[PDB]
């Protein structure tokens, strides 16, 4: 017959939006990261994701400029909590990064694995069986993606199931953030989410379009191209309705 993740619970779920803006501590300590600037604009995406996940009945839980250590604790918290009355848990990280890592206010990395593994079925029994979504807007390399011409257009379940992981970009390539409007991925993830949610489309359908937009978006300057790339271990269509 069918299957779809439950999302009846009025207060859907938490939305730890971790918005990093000031990397001054880093510009001092970690040497390599001294010629690093601040992520100006992140606020437009924090105030973008907050708006989106508001009509979707998500009880947003914003967090200032946090450092790795604080970040780990911030997660270690929403992990010992109970999420039964919740049928979904979302986490958004915004900051710089590199090869599978996400720098914090301080300047020291923090492997994605050790952040997303914090909410396995085991670590958080309350979240077992419920979708745990992760949106990570951050660099992932120093390389720029080239752009070729298309010329068209009762039981036990696995411990790491139900996991949506939206990556602002493929590995080894850079993500793009614009000071005036916002970052491409986060903005498309909303302008496409906040619109396709009324008409009831699963997130997997939405992320497809999102990869379409960002693929057209082009860095007029250094012939740059971005290309998101999600990963999911979900079991049923993830969809959230509103009013």
């Amino acid at each position: 017959l069918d299957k779809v993740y439950q999302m009846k619970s009025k207060p859907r779920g938490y939305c730890l939006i971790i918005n990093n803006h000031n990397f001054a501590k880093a510009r001092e300590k970690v040497p390599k990261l001294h010629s690093i600037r601040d992520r100006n604009g992140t606020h437009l995406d924090a105030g973008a994701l907050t708006t989106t996940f508001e009509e979707l009945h998500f009880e947003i839980k914003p967090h200032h400029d946090c450092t790795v250590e604080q970040i780990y604790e911030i997660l270690k918290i929403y992990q010992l909590m109970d999420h039964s009355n919740m049928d979904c848990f979302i986490c958004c990280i915004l900051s710089h990064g590199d090869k599978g890592i996400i720098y914090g206010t301080d300047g020291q990395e923090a492997p994605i694995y050790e952040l997303t593994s914090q909410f396995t079925g085991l670590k958080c029994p309350s979240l077992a069986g419920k979708p745990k979504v992760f949106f990570i807007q951050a660099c992932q390399g120093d390389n720029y993606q080239k752009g070729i011409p298309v010329e068209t257009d009762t039981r036990y379940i696995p411990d790491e199931a139900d996991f949506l992981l939206g990556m602002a970009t493929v590995n080894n390539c850079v993500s793009y953030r614009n000071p005036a409007e916002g970052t491409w991925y986060i903005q498309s993830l909303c302008q496409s989410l906040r619109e396709r949610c009324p008409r009831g489309d699963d997130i997997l359908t939405i992320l497809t379009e999102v990869n379409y937009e960002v693929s057209n978006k082009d860095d007029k300057k250094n012939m740059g191209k971005q290309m998101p790339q999600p990963t999911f271990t979900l079991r049923k269509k993830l969809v959230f309705p509103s009013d």
Binding site: H96, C139, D142, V174, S175, Y176, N178, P179, E181, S188
Partner: protein, 293 residues
């Protein structure tokens, strides 16, 4: 966050002229030529308010230390919304500097004991017609610094030169002057940092006004001219502005302001920030200032 920028392309021109004591200022000069592997004797000259009492070489870390202090001062004007991410020699081996009384250089010029001989007439001849005529004038003063960057100059760092000199008459001549060309137009690419000098909008309005800025390729682009007089500031510069539209939701516009060029003066500090980046002007002159008398 990328480590592949600045390289065999970064070479505009950086100049810093500061007053070191009662009557001694120091000139720091870094140009494109000094940053390339010369294979033959290279000649270059400019103007100095007074005579040089010593010439030395400084570390290239200086090129960025200067360009920063200034580029930042102008960047506070802009609104760039571009996408971001996450009879008086001074010999030495390599070089050879000579500082003569402006007028004297004309009369003897040919004398190349500075060893710019093997360039013969077919090479020196050039400089007397396109350069020399623009370094000597009715004010037979205006000493002319003559350098001859000989090969080997590339070896090791410290490509930056520094002239310690004694200003005559309280004058400071920031060397923007070029090599008179047939076309008639000159392209500027230089940043300067001079201090202990008194403002002078008269000559700054004249310069800035005759500047043709680079294009952003947008029909809606307009090049406005400014003349602000802030708290402890006073800016004379030309910027290029154009409004932009959102990339998604609301119809929110974005008013750009880029390619700013001109002069910024710190009323308190008594410092002069200059920025003429890739701008064209039919005006090929030096900028003369007066040291806080």
């Amino acid at each position: 966050c990328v480590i592949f920028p600045v390289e065999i392309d970064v070479s505009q021109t950086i100049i810093r002229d500061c007053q070191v004591d009662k009557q001694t200022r120091e000139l720091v000069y870094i140009n494109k030529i000094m940053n390339t592997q010369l294979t033959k004797p290279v000649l270059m000259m400019f103007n100095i308010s007074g005579p040089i009492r010593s010439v030395t070489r400084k570390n290239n870390n200086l090129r960025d230390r200067i360009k920063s202090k200034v580029d930042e001062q102008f960047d506070q004007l802009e609104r760039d919304y571009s996408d971001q991410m996450d009879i008086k020699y001074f010999k030495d081996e390599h070089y050879s500097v000579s500082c003569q009384n402006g007028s004297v250089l004309k009369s003897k010029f040919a004398k190349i004991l500075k060893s710019h001989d093997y360039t013969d007439k077919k090479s020196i001849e050039a400089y007397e017609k396109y350069c020399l005529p623009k370094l000597v004038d009715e004010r037979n003063d205006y000493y002319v610094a003559v350098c001859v960057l000989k090969p080997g100059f590339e070896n090791g760092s410290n490509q930056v030169l520094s002239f310690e000199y004694n200003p005559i008459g309280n004058k400071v001549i920031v060397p923007f002057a070029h090599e008179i060309n047939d076309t008639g137009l000159y392209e500027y690419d230089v940043v300067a940092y001079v201090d202990s000098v008194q403002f002078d909008g008269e000559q700054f309005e004249e310069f800035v006004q005759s500047l043709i800025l680079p294009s952003s390729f947008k029909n809606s682009e307009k090049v406005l001219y400014y003349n602000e007089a802030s708290k402890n500031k006073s800016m004379i510069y030309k910027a290029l502005e154009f409004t932009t539209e959102s990339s998604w939701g609301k119809s929110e516009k974005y008013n750009w302001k880029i390619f700013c060029n001109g002069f910024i003066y710190d009323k308190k500090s008594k410092v002069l920030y200059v920025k003429l980046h890739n701008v064209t002007s039919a005006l090929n002159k030096n900028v003369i200032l007066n040291t806080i008398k």
